[PDB]
Coordinates of C-alpha atoms and ligand atoms in Angstrom, one line a residue:
Chain A
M46 CA -10.6 -8.7 -26.8
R47 CA -12.6 -9.2 -23.7
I48 CA -10.8 -8.7 -20.3
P49 CA -9.0 -5.3 -19.7
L50 CA -5.6 -5.4 -18.1
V51 CA -3.6 -2.8 -16.3
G52 CA -0.8 -1.5 -18.7
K53 CA -1.6 -4.1 -21.4
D54 CA -3.9 -4.9 -24.2
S55 CA -7.0 -6.6 -23.1
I56 CA -7.1 -10.5 -23.5
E57 CA -9.6 -13.1 -24.3
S58 CA -10.7 -15.2 -21.3
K59 CA -8.9 -18.2 -22.7
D60 CA -5.6 -16.4 -22.0
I61 CA -6.1 -15.7 -18.2
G62 CA -4.3 -18.8 -17.3
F63 CA -3.5 -19.6 -13.7
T64 CA -5.3 -16.9 -11.7
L65 CA -5.3 -15.6 -8.2
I66 CA -8.9 -14.2 -8.1
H67 CA -8.5 -12.0 -5.0
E68 CA -5.2 -10.3 -4.0
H69 CA -4.3 -6.7 -3.1
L70 CA -1.0 -5.1 -4.2
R71 CA -1.7 -2.3 -1.7
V72 CA -4.5 -1.1 0.6
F73 CA -5.0 2.2 2.4
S74 CA -7.7 4.7 3.6
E75 CA -7.8 7.4 0.9
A76 CA -8.5 10.2 3.5
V77 CA -5.8 9.1 5.9
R78 CA -3.1 9.0 3.3
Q79 CA -4.2 12.2 1.7
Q80 CA -4.2 14.0 5.1
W81 CA -1.1 12.4 6.7
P82 CA 1.3 11.2 4.0
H83 CA 4.1 10.9 6.6
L84 CA 2.6 7.7 7.7
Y85 CA 3.4 6.0 4.3
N86 CA 6.3 4.9 2.4
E87 CA 5.8 4.7 -1.4
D88 CA 9.2 2.9 -2.1
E89 CA 8.7 0.2 0.4
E90 CA 5.1 -0.5 -0.7
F91 CA 6.4 -0.8 -4.2
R92 CA 9.2 -3.3 -3.3
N93 CA 6.8 -5.5 -1.3
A94 CA 4.3 -5.7 -4.1
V95 CA 6.9 -6.3 -6.8
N96 CA 8.5 -9.0 -4.6
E97 CA 5.2 -10.7 -3.9
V98 CA 4.1 -10.7 -7.5
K99 CA 7.4 -12.0 -8.6
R100 CA 7.3 -15.0 -6.2
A101 CA 3.7 -15.7 -7.3
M102 CA 4.9 -15.8 -11.0
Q103 CA 7.6 -18.1 -10.1
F104 CA 5.0 -20.7 -9.0
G105 CA 3.2 -20.2 -12.4
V106 CA 0.7 -17.5 -11.6
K107 CA -0.3 -15.7 -14.7
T108 CA -3.1 -13.4 -13.7
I109 CA -3.9 -11.6 -10.6
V110 CA -7.3 -10.0 -9.9
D111 CA -7.1 -7.1 -7.5
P112 CA -10.4 -5.9 -6.0
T113 CA -8.9 -2.7 -4.5
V114 CA -11.6 0.0 -5.0
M115 CA -12.9 3.2 -3.5
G116 CA -12.4 2.9 0.3
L117 CA -9.4 0.6 -0.1
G118 CA -7.1 3.1 -1.8
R119 CA -7.2 2.0 -5.5
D120 CA -4.3 3.6 -7.3
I121 CA -4.2 2.7 -11.0
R122 CA -0.8 4.4 -11.5
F123 CA 0.8 2.3 -8.7
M124 CA -0.6 -0.9 -10.2
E125 CA 0.8 0.0 -13.7
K126 CA 4.3 0.5 -12.1
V127 CA 4.0 -3.0 -10.6
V128 CA 2.9 -4.4 -13.9
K129 CA 5.8 -2.7 -15.7
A130 CA 8.2 -4.1 -13.2
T131 CA 6.9 -7.8 -13.1
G132 CA 5.0 -8.5 -16.5
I133 CA 1.9 -9.9 -14.6
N134 CA -1.5 -9.9 -16.0
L135 CA -3.4 -7.6 -13.6
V136 CA -7.2 -7.0 -13.6
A137 CA -8.3 -3.9 -12.0
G138 CA -11.9 -3.2 -10.9
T139 CA -14.2 -0.5 -9.9
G140 CA -16.8 -0.3 -7.2
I141 CA -17.3 0.9 -3.7
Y142 CA -16.2 -0.6 -0.5
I143 CA -18.2 0.4 2.6
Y144 CA -19.8 -1.3 5.6
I145 CA -22.4 1.3 6.8
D146 CA -22.7 4.7 4.9
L147 CA -21.4 6.1 1.7
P148 CA -19.3 9.2 1.7
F149 CA -21.3 12.5 2.1
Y150 CA -20.8 13.1 -1.6
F151 CA -23.7 10.5 -2.3
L152 CA -26.3 12.3 -0.2
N153 CA -29.3 12.8 -2.4
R154 CA -27.7 10.9 -5.4
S155 CA -29.5 8.1 -7.1
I156 CA -28.5 4.6 -7.5
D157 CA -28.0 5.4 -11.3
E158 CA -25.5 8.0 -10.5
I159 CA -23.5 5.5 -8.5
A160 CA -23.7 3.0 -11.3
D161 CA -22.5 5.8 -13.8
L162 CA -19.3 5.9 -11.9
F163 CA -18.7 2.1 -12.3
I164 CA -19.6 2.3 -16.0
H165 CA -17.2 5.2 -16.6
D166 CA -14.4 3.1 -15.0
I167 CA -15.4 0.2 -17.2
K168 CA -15.9 2.0 -20.5
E169 CA -13.7 5.2 -20.3
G170 CA -11.0 4.3 -17.9
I171 CA -9.8 4.6 -14.3
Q172 CA -8.6 7.8 -12.6
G173 CA -7.8 9.7 -15.9
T174 CA -6.1 6.7 -17.6
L175 CA -7.2 4.4 -20.3
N176 CA -6.9 1.4 -18.0
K177 CA -10.4 0.0 -17.7
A178 CA -12.1 -1.9 -14.9
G179 CA -12.9 -5.6 -15.6
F180 CA -15.3 -6.1 -12.7
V181 CA -17.2 -4.4 -9.9
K182 CA -16.4 -4.9 -6.3
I183 CA -19.0 -4.4 -3.4
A184 CA -19.1 -5.2 0.3
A185 CA -21.0 -5.8 3.4
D186 CA -19.9 -6.9 6.8
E187 CA -21.0 -7.1 10.5
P188 CA -23.6 -4.1 10.1
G189 CA -25.4 -6.3 7.4
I190 CA -27.2 -4.8 4.4
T191 CA -27.6 -1.1 5.3
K192 CA -29.6 1.3 3.0
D193 CA -26.3 2.6 1.5
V194 CA -24.7 -0.9 1.2
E195 CA -27.9 -1.9 -0.6
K196 CA -27.5 1.3 -3.1
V197 CA -24.1 0.0 -4.0
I198 CA -25.3 -3.6 -4.6
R199 CA -28.0 -2.3 -7.0
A200 CA -25.6 0.0 -8.7
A201 CA -23.3 -3.0 -9.3
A202 CA -26.2 -4.8 -10.9
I203 CA -26.9 -2.0 -13.2
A204 CA -23.2 -1.8 -14.3
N205 CA -23.1 -5.6 -14.9
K206 CA -26.2 -5.5 -17.2
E207 CA -24.8 -2.7 -19.2
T208 CA -21.2 -3.9 -19.4
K209 CA -21.4 -7.7 -18.6
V210 CA -18.3 -7.5 -16.2
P211 CA -18.5 -9.9 -13.3
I212 CA -19.0 -8.9 -9.7
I213 CA -16.8 -9.7 -6.7
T214 CA -18.2 -9.2 -3.2
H215 CA -16.8 -8.9 0.2
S216 CA -19.0 -10.5 2.9
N217 CA -19.1 -11.6 6.4
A218 CA -19.2 -15.4 6.5
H219 CA -21.2 -15.5 9.8
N220 CA -24.2 -13.1 9.3
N221 CA -25.8 -14.0 6.0
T222 CA -24.6 -11.0 4.0
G223 CA -23.3 -13.2 1.2
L224 CA -26.5 -14.9 0.7
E225 CA -28.3 -11.4 0.7
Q226 CA -25.8 -10.0 -1.8
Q227 CA -26.6 -12.9 -4.2
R228 CA -30.3 -12.5 -3.7
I229 CA -30.4 -8.8 -4.3
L230 CA -28.1 -9.1 -7.4
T231 CA -29.9 -11.9 -9.0
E232 CA -33.3 -10.4 -8.4
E233 CA -32.0 -7.3 -10.3
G234 CA -31.2 -9.5 -13.3
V235 CA -27.6 -10.4 -12.7
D236 CA -26.6 -13.9 -13.9
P237 CA -25.6 -15.8 -10.7
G238 CA -22.6 -17.2 -12.5
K239 CA -21.3 -13.7 -12.8
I240 CA -21.0 -13.3 -9.0
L241 CA -18.3 -14.3 -6.7
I242 CA -19.5 -14.2 -3.0
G243 CA -16.4 -13.6 -1.0
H244 CA -14.8 -14.7 2.2
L245 CA -17.0 -17.8 2.6
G246 CA -13.8 -19.6 3.5
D247 CA -13.9 -17.7 6.8
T248 CA -16.5 -20.4 8.0
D249 CA -16.6 -24.1 8.2
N250 CA -20.5 -24.1 7.9
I251 CA -20.6 -26.3 4.8
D252 CA -24.4 -26.0 4.3
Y253 CA -24.3 -22.2 4.2
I254 CA -21.5 -22.3 1.5
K255 CA -23.4 -25.0 -0.5
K256 CA -26.6 -23.0 -0.3
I257 CA -24.8 -20.0 -2.1
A258 CA -23.0 -22.3 -4.7
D259 CA -26.3 -24.1 -5.4
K260 CA -27.9 -20.8 -6.3
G261 CA -25.3 -20.6 -9.1
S262 CA -22.5 -18.2 -7.8
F263 CA -18.8 -18.8 -7.2
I264 CA -17.8 -19.2 -3.6
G265 CA -14.8 -17.4 -2.3
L266 CA -12.5 -19.5 -0.2
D267 CA -10.3 -16.7 -0.6
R268 CA -8.5 -15.7 2.8
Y269 CA -6.0 -18.5 3.0
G270 CA -3.4 -17.5 5.7
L271 CA -5.7 -15.3 7.7
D272 CA -5.9 -17.6 10.8
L273 CA -7.8 -14.9 12.8
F274 CA -10.8 -15.6 10.6
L275 CA -10.2 -19.4 10.2
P276 CA -6.9 -21.5 10.6
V277 CA -5.3 -22.9 7.4
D278 CA -6.1 -26.5 8.5
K279 CA -9.9 -25.7 9.0
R280 CA -10.0 -24.0 5.6
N281 CA -8.3 -27.1 4.0
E282 CA -10.7 -29.5 5.6
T283 CA -13.6 -27.4 4.3
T284 CA -12.0 -27.0 0.8
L285 CA -11.4 -30.6 0.5
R286 CA -14.9 -31.5 1.7
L287 CA -16.5 -29.1 -0.9
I288 CA -14.3 -30.7 -3.6
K289 CA -15.3 -34.3 -2.6
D290 CA -19.0 -33.2 -2.7
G291 CA -18.4 -32.2 -6.3
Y292 CA -18.4 -28.3 -5.9
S293 CA -15.2 -27.7 -7.9
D294 CA -17.4 -26.0 -10.4
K295 CA -18.0 -23.1 -8.0
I296 CA -14.9 -23.0 -5.8
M297 CA -12.4 -20.1 -6.1
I298 CA -9.3 -19.9 -4.0
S299 CA -7.0 -17.1 -3.0
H300 CA -5.3 -15.3 -0.1
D301 CA -6.7 -11.7 0.0
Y302 CA -3.2 -10.8 0.7
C303 CA -2.0 -7.3 1.1
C304 CA 1.5 -6.8 -0.1
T305 CA 0.9 -3.7 2.2
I306 CA -2.1 -2.6 4.4
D307 CA -2.4 0.4 6.7
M308 CA -4.9 -1.1 9.2
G309 CA -3.9 -1.0 13.0
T310 CA -4.4 -4.8 12.9
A311 CA -1.9 -5.4 10.2
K312 CA 1.0 -4.4 12.5
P313 CA 4.2 -6.6 12.4
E314 CA 3.7 -7.7 16.1
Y315 CA 0.3 -9.2 15.3
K316 CA 1.4 -11.2 12.3
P317 CA 2.7 -14.4 14.2
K318 CA -0.5 -14.3 16.2
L319 CA -3.2 -13.7 13.5
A320 CA -1.5 -14.6 10.1
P321 CA 1.8 -16.4 10.5
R322 CA 2.1 -18.0 7.0
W323 CA 0.0 -15.4 5.3
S324 CA 1.5 -14.5 1.8
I325 CA 0.5 -14.5 -1.7
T326 CA 2.0 -18.0 -2.3
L327 CA 0.7 -19.9 0.7
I328 CA -1.6 -22.1 -1.4
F329 CA 1.4 -23.5 -3.3
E330 CA 3.2 -24.1 -0.2
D331 CA 0.4 -25.8 1.8
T332 CA -3.1 -25.9 0.4
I333 CA -2.6 -27.4 -3.1
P334 CA 0.0 -30.1 -1.8
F335 CA -2.5 -30.9 0.9
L336 CA -5.3 -31.5 -1.6
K337 CA -3.0 -33.6 -3.9
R338 CA -2.1 -35.7 -0.8
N339 CA -5.7 -36.2 -0.3
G340 CA -6.5 -37.6 -3.8
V341 CA -7.5 -34.3 -5.5
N342 CA -6.1 -34.6 -9.1
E343 CA -4.6 -32.0 -11.4
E344 CA -7.8 -31.6 -13.4
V345 CA -9.6 -30.2 -10.3
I346 CA -6.7 -27.8 -9.5
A347 CA -6.9 -26.6 -13.0
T348 CA -10.8 -26.2 -12.8
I349 CA -10.4 -24.0 -9.7
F350 CA -7.5 -21.8 -10.8
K351 CA -8.1 -21.7 -14.5
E352 CA -11.5 -22.7 -15.7
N353 CA -13.5 -21.0 -13.0
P354 CA -11.8 -17.7 -13.5
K355 CA -12.2 -18.1 -17.2
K356 CA -16.0 -18.7 -16.9
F357 CA -16.3 -15.9 -14.5
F358 CA -14.8 -13.4 -16.9
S359 CA -16.6 -15.0 -20.1
Chain B
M148 CA 3.9 34.7 16.3
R149 CA 1.0 33.0 17.9
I150 CA -1.6 32.1 15.2
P151 CA -0.2 30.2 12.2
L152 CA -1.4 31.4 8.7
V153 CA -1.4 29.6 5.5
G154 CA 1.3 31.0 3.1
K155 CA 2.2 33.8 5.7
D156 CA 4.1 34.4 8.8
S157 CA 2.2 33.8 12.0
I158 CA 0.4 36.6 13.6
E159 CA -0.2 37.9 17.0
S160 CA -3.8 37.0 17.9
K161 CA -4.4 40.7 18.8
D162 CA -3.8 41.5 15.0
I163 CA -6.5 39.0 13.7
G164 CA -8.9 41.8 12.9
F165 CA -12.5 41.1 11.6
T166 CA -12.8 37.4 11.4
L167 CA -15.0 34.7 9.8
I168 CA -14.6 31.9 12.3
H169 CA -16.1 29.1 10.1
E170 CA -16.0 29.1 6.3
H171 CA -14.7 26.5 3.7
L172 CA -12.8 27.4 0.6
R173 CA -13.6 23.9 -0.7
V174 CA -15.1 20.7 0.5
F175 CA -15.1 17.2 -0.9
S176 CA -14.8 13.4 0.0
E177 CA -11.2 12.4 -0.2
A178 CA -12.1 8.9 -1.5
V179 CA -14.5 10.0 -4.2
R180 CA -12.2 12.8 -5.6
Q181 CA -9.4 10.4 -5.6
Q182 CA -11.3 7.5 -7.4
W183 CA -13.3 9.8 -9.8
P184 CA -11.4 13.0 -10.5
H185 CA -13.7 13.4 -13.6
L186 CA -16.4 14.7 -11.2
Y187 CA -14.4 17.8 -10.2
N188 CA -13.2 20.9 -11.9
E189 CA -10.3 22.5 -10.0
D190 CA -10.4 25.8 -12.1
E191 CA -13.9 26.5 -11.1
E192 CA -13.2 25.7 -7.5
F193 CA -10.2 28.0 -7.5
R194 CA -12.1 30.9 -9.2
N195 CA -15.1 30.5 -6.9
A196 CA -12.9 30.5 -3.7
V197 CA -10.9 33.5 -4.9
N198 CA -14.0 35.5 -5.8
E199 CA -15.8 34.8 -2.6
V200 CA -12.7 35.6 -0.4
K201 CA -12.1 38.9 -2.4
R202 CA -15.8 40.0 -1.9
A203 CA -15.4 39.1 1.7
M204 CA -12.2 41.3 2.0
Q205 CA -14.1 44.2 0.3
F206 CA -16.6 44.0 3.3
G207 CA -13.5 44.5 5.8
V208 CA -12.9 40.7 6.5
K209 CA -9.2 40.2 7.5
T210 CA -9.2 36.6 8.6
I211 CA -10.9 33.5 7.6
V212 CA -10.8 30.3 9.7
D213 CA -11.3 27.3 7.6
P214 CA -12.2 24.0 9.5
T215 CA -11.8 21.8 6.4
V216 CA -10.1 18.7 7.9
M217 CA -9.9 14.8 7.2
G218 CA -13.1 13.8 5.8
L219 CA -13.9 17.2 4.2
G220 CA -11.0 17.3 1.7
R221 CA -8.4 19.5 3.4
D222 CA -5.9 20.6 0.8
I223 CA -3.2 22.9 2.1
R224 CA -1.7 23.6 -1.4
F225 CA -5.1 24.7 -2.7
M226 CA -5.3 26.9 0.3
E227 CA -2.0 28.6 -0.2
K228 CA -2.8 29.3 -3.9
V229 CA -6.0 31.0 -2.7
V230 CA -3.9 33.0 -0.2
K231 CA -1.4 34.1 -2.9
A232 CA -4.3 35.3 -5.1
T233 CA -6.2 37.3 -2.3
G234 CA -3.8 38.2 0.5
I235 CA -6.3 37.0 3.1
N236 CA -5.3 35.7 6.5
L237 CA -6.2 32.1 6.5
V238 CA -6.1 29.8 9.5
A239 CA -6.0 26.1 8.6
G240 CA -6.7 23.3 11.2
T241 CA -6.3 19.7 11.8
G242 CA -8.6 17.0 13.1
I243 CA -11.1 14.4 11.9
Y244 CA -14.6 14.8 10.7
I245 CA -16.8 11.7 11.1
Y246 CA -20.4 10.9 12.1
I247 CA -20.1 7.2 12.8
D248 CA -16.9 5.2 12.4
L249 CA -13.3 6.0 11.7
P250 CA -11.5 4.9 8.5
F251 CA -10.2 1.3 8.8
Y252 CA -6.8 2.7 9.2
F253 CA -7.7 3.4 12.8
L254 CA -8.8 -0.2 13.7
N255 CA -6.8 -1.1 16.8
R256 CA -5.3 2.3 17.2
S257 CA -5.3 4.2 20.4
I258 CA -6.6 7.6 21.1
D259 CA -2.9 8.8 21.5
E260 CA -2.0 7.7 17.9
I261 CA -4.8 9.8 16.7
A262 CA -3.6 12.8 18.8
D263 CA -0.1 12.4 17.4
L264 CA -1.7 13.0 14.0
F265 CA -3.1 16.3 15.3
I266 CA 0.0 17.2 17.0
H267 CA 2.1 16.5 13.9
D268 CA -0.1 19.1 11.9
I269 CA 0.2 21.7 14.6
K270 CA 4.0 21.3 15.4
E271 CA 5.5 20.0 12.1
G272 CA 3.2 21.1 9.4
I273 CA 0.3 20.0 7.1
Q274 CA 0.7 17.4 4.3
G275 CA 4.4 17.8 3.9
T276 CA 4.5 21.6 4.1
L277 CA 5.5 24.0 6.8
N278 CA 2.0 25.5 7.1
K279 CA 0.8 24.7 10.5
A280 CA -2.6 23.9 12.0
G281 CA -4.0 26.5 14.3
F282 CA -6.8 24.6 15.8
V283 CA -8.4 21.1 16.0
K284 CA -11.8 20.3 14.3
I285 CA -14.1 17.4 15.5
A286 CA -17.6 16.3 14.7
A287 CA -20.7 14.6 15.8
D288 CA -24.1 14.5 14.3
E289 CA -27.4 12.5 13.9
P290 CA -25.8 9.2 14.9
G291 CA -24.7 10.8 18.2
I292 CA -21.5 10.2 20.3
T293 CA -20.4 6.9 18.9
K294 CA -17.3 5.1 20.1
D295 CA -15.1 6.3 17.2
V296 CA -16.6 9.8 17.5
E297 CA -15.7 9.9 21.1
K298 CA -12.1 8.6 20.5
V299 CA -11.7 11.7 18.2
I300 CA -13.0 14.1 20.8
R301 CA -10.6 12.7 23.4
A302 CA -7.7 12.9 20.9
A303 CA -8.5 16.5 20.3
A304 CA -8.4 17.1 24.1
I305 CA -4.9 15.6 24.2
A306 CA -3.7 17.8 21.3
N307 CA -5.2 21.0 22.9
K308 CA -3.5 20.2 26.1
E309 CA -0.1 19.7 24.3
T310 CA -0.2 22.6 21.9
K311 CA -2.8 25.0 23.4
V312 CA -4.6 25.4 20.1
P313 CA -8.5 25.9 20.4
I314 CA -11.0 23.4 19.4
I315 CA -13.9 23.9 17.0
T316 CA -16.7 21.4 16.7
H317 CA -19.4 20.3 14.4
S318 CA -22.6 19.2 16.2
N319 CA -26.3 18.6 15.7
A320 CA -28.3 21.3 17.3
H321 CA -31.3 18.9 18.1
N322 CA -29.7 15.9 19.8
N323 CA -27.3 17.2 22.6
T324 CA -24.1 16.2 20.8
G325 CA -22.9 19.8 21.3
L326 CA -23.4 19.6 25.1
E327 CA -21.7 16.1 25.1
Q328 CA -18.7 17.4 23.2
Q329 CA -18.3 20.1 25.7
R330 CA -18.7 17.7 28.6
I331 CA -16.2 15.2 27.5
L332 CA -13.6 17.9 26.5
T333 CA -13.9 19.7 29.9
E334 CA -13.8 16.5 31.8
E335 CA -10.5 15.8 30.0
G336 CA -9.0 19.2 31.1
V337 CA -9.8 21.4 28.1
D338 CA -10.4 25.0 29.1
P339 CA -14.2 25.6 28.1
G340 CA -13.2 29.0 26.7
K341 CA -11.0 27.2 24.2
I342 CA -14.0 25.4 22.6
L343 CA -16.3 26.6 19.9
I344 CA -19.5 24.4 19.9
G345 CA -20.6 24.6 16.3
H346 CA -24.1 24.8 14.4
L347 CA -26.0 25.9 17.5
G348 CA -27.6 28.5 15.1
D349 CA -29.6 25.6 13.6
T350 CA -32.1 25.8 16.4
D351 CA -34.3 28.4 18.0
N352 CA -34.1 26.5 21.3
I353 CA -32.6 29.4 23.1
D354 CA -32.3 27.4 26.5
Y355 CA -30.1 24.7 25.1
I356 CA -27.7 27.4 23.5
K357 CA -27.5 29.4 26.8
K358 CA -26.6 26.3 28.8
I359 CA -23.5 25.7 26.7
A360 CA -22.4 29.3 26.8
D361 CA -23.0 29.2 30.6
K362 CA -20.7 26.3 30.8
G363 CA -18.0 28.8 29.3
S364 CA -17.7 27.7 25.6
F365 CA -18.3 29.9 22.5
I366 CA -21.5 29.2 20.6
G367 CA -21.5 28.8 16.8
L368 CA -24.3 30.7 15.2
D369 CA -22.5 29.7 12.1
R370 CA -24.7 28.6 9.3
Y371 CA -26.2 31.9 8.1
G372 CA -27.8 31.1 4.6
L373 CA -28.5 27.4 5.3
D374 CA -32.3 27.9 5.4
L375 CA -32.8 24.0 5.3
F376 CA -31.4 24.0 8.9
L377 CA -33.1 27.3 9.9
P378 CA -34.2 30.3 7.9
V379 CA -32.2 33.6 8.0
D380 CA -35.0 35.4 9.9
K381 CA -35.3 32.8 12.7
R382 CA -31.6 32.8 13.1
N383 CA -31.5 36.6 13.3
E384 CA -34.2 36.4 16.0
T385 CA -32.2 34.0 18.1
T386 CA -29.0 36.0 17.6
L387 CA -30.6 39.2 18.6
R388 CA -32.3 37.6 21.6
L389 CA -29.0 36.0 22.9
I390 CA -27.3 39.4 22.5
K391 CA -30.0 41.3 24.5
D392 CA -29.8 38.6 27.2
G393 CA -26.0 39.4 27.4
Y394 CA -24.2 36.5 25.5
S395 CA -22.3 38.7 23.1
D396 CA -19.0 37.6 24.6
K397 CA -19.7 33.9 23.7
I398 CA -21.2 34.4 20.3
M399 CA -19.5 33.7 17.1
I400 CA -21.2 34.2 13.7
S401 CA -20.3 32.7 10.4
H402 CA -21.8 31.1 7.2
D403 CA -20.1 27.7 7.0
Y404 CA -20.2 28.5 3.3
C405 CA -18.6 26.2 0.9
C406 CA -17.4 28.0 -2.1
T407 CA -17.6 24.5 -3.6
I408 CA -19.1 21.4 -2.1
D409 CA -19.2 18.0 -3.9
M410 CA -22.5 16.5 -2.2
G411 CA -25.8 16.3 -4.1
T412 CA -27.7 17.9 -1.3
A413 CA -26.0 21.2 -1.9
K414 CA -26.2 21.3 -5.8
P415 CA -27.5 24.1 -8.1
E416 CA -31.1 22.6 -8.5
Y417 CA -31.8 22.6 -4.7
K418 CA -30.2 26.0 -3.8
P419 CA -33.3 28.1 -4.5
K420 CA -35.2 26.2 -1.8
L421 CA -32.5 25.1 0.7
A422 CA -30.2 28.2 0.7
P423 CA -31.2 31.0 -1.8
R424 CA -29.0 33.7 -0.4
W425 CA -26.1 31.6 1.0
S426 CA -22.7 33.1 0.5
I427 CA -19.6 34.3 2.3
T428 CA -21.0 37.8 2.6
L429 CA -24.6 37.2 3.6
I430 CA -24.0 38.6 7.1
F431 CA -23.0 42.0 5.7
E432 CA -26.0 42.1 3.5
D433 CA -28.6 40.9 5.8
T434 CA -27.5 39.9 9.5
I435 CA -25.3 42.7 10.6
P436 CA -27.6 45.5 9.3
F437 CA -30.5 43.7 11.1
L438 CA -28.7 43.7 14.3
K439 CA -27.6 47.3 14.1
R440 CA -31.1 48.4 13.2
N441 CA -32.3 46.7 16.3
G442 CA -30.2 48.4 19.0
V443 CA -26.9 46.5 18.6
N444 CA -24.0 49.0 18.8
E445 CA -20.7 48.9 17.0
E446 CA -18.9 47.7 20.2
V447 CA -21.0 44.5 20.2
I448 CA -20.4 43.8 16.5
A449 CA -16.6 44.2 17.2
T450 CA -16.9 41.9 20.2
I451 CA -18.4 39.2 18.1
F452 CA -16.2 39.4 14.9
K453 CA -12.9 40.7 16.5
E454 CA -12.7 40.3 20.2
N455 CA -14.2 36.7 20.5
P456 CA -11.9 35.2 17.8
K457 CA -9.0 37.0 19.4
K458 CA -9.8 35.4 22.9
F459 CA -10.5 32.0 21.3
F460 CA -6.9 32.0 19.8
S461 CA -5.3 33.4 23.0
Ligands
LIG565 CO1 -12.8 -8.4 1.5
LIG566 CO1 -20.1 21.4 10.4
LIG567 FE1 -9.9 -8.1 -0.2
LIG568 FE1 -18.3 23.5 8.3

């Protein structure tokens, strides 16, 4: 059809339905898990992911896009288990997630070599399976656009032009990395409407967010629940403002929730402090009702969670 | 019963025999191999490692110390397959190999949690097996002693003090990282004679190397064949000079040979220029005969390849 799904036949974009554009079933450092498996519990990770997905589906979620890639512990076999146990539409991706340098493997390897890896996942399949990647994920954070971060961005552009799959990014909302990602990608021939600039919800700087949307890319208000980056009420005020200003056409919303994450920051005794209400269904429990209370109609909600994702994968 | 071996009973350190203190059976980036297995061929890797180790045993090598740790693709099960096919004494280690930052797993984690990881490998076993680590490996390079790099160094100190296993390091011969590693470790209470400061053979700056040995640590003239860091003839000159100046009892010699390495820098095309005669037996073909034809007696060669490793692990 058009959009590949983990453990299912691919579907036309018209069948995506209500979508969460940025959620993680599970995240871990590949090297750590590989060297110290005693630190992880496969059964527990599985129960948590299955339980989260089931609750999301009870609110009407039909598709989840999971941008777990190299550097975040992408595991296509774990994903297909969750799919088999829930019946969710799951879009997996390919890409590379780094802030500074690439793994030593890429020393003296061209940008084309890197792009070949993405294209392989898109055309052949992921990690020895026939499950194909439906988008490319790239990142940049506090260190900005370093040389290697820039190789990865250009590689994504190459993969997009060859395969037409969209691009999701991770960025730091406070240092201009999002704007730079969009610039570099679009200068390399990527259609701006095929890019989602991520974690823009981490800021309340409306002008910066409009600046990116105005250049034709989707804007990721995609960390709902992560108060440490920005409280739910601040995000809500920003989201409502953008909607009132007529930016529904570019807004995408999600939680960036990790049904499991191995970071030292994601410890249970830090949850009440940094992400008390953080879950894969927080937007149903708070954000969406807040928007409706403030005069946002059902057409707008549908545009954000249905039409936008559809255009993005079309 | 003192030095753990992979796939064998532990040995007394006095039984170690002729030893190669720094060689790799296989090296790769965990994240890359995990996300793109299509890039690797395990049969070739296994065949290459077995062939190299067998040729090494033909030259009288009894023991090989393999500092492949997190970040370099340590794989204890691959290692025991190689032992079963060769009968070599193989010492595995634990530790972390980074130049700049630690994997995100380590955000908000203490130096002690890191040490616990090393201590787990040494006392419990590696990757779910009963094969135990016989030393701790750490690294620092061009980027220098970063915060994360230092945290790892200090973790290694804790592990040494708890388990008594020696410490092997990777350093950059031109930026003082070696001397820094030695300083931080000794300050933390690590016996200098329990430290092998690695890759010092990459420079002909005899003064720098001597300073480190004078501080009481072993010096790694351990990259024989890697001409891109320093040609074999210049290495041999430094080695011979250090021996004549009476540093035999602090010198350790090796190849740092990777029977298989995944990085593009060390791939077939560049080998003829960067490392034309680089293998696990180069020192028997070139280095040792050079030393012996230049007034180095058999007692000195035994001190370097038998006595020094014995002390290091005592
Ligand atoms: Co992100
Ligand atoms: Co090294
Ligand atoms: Fe994410
Ligand atoms: Fe090495």
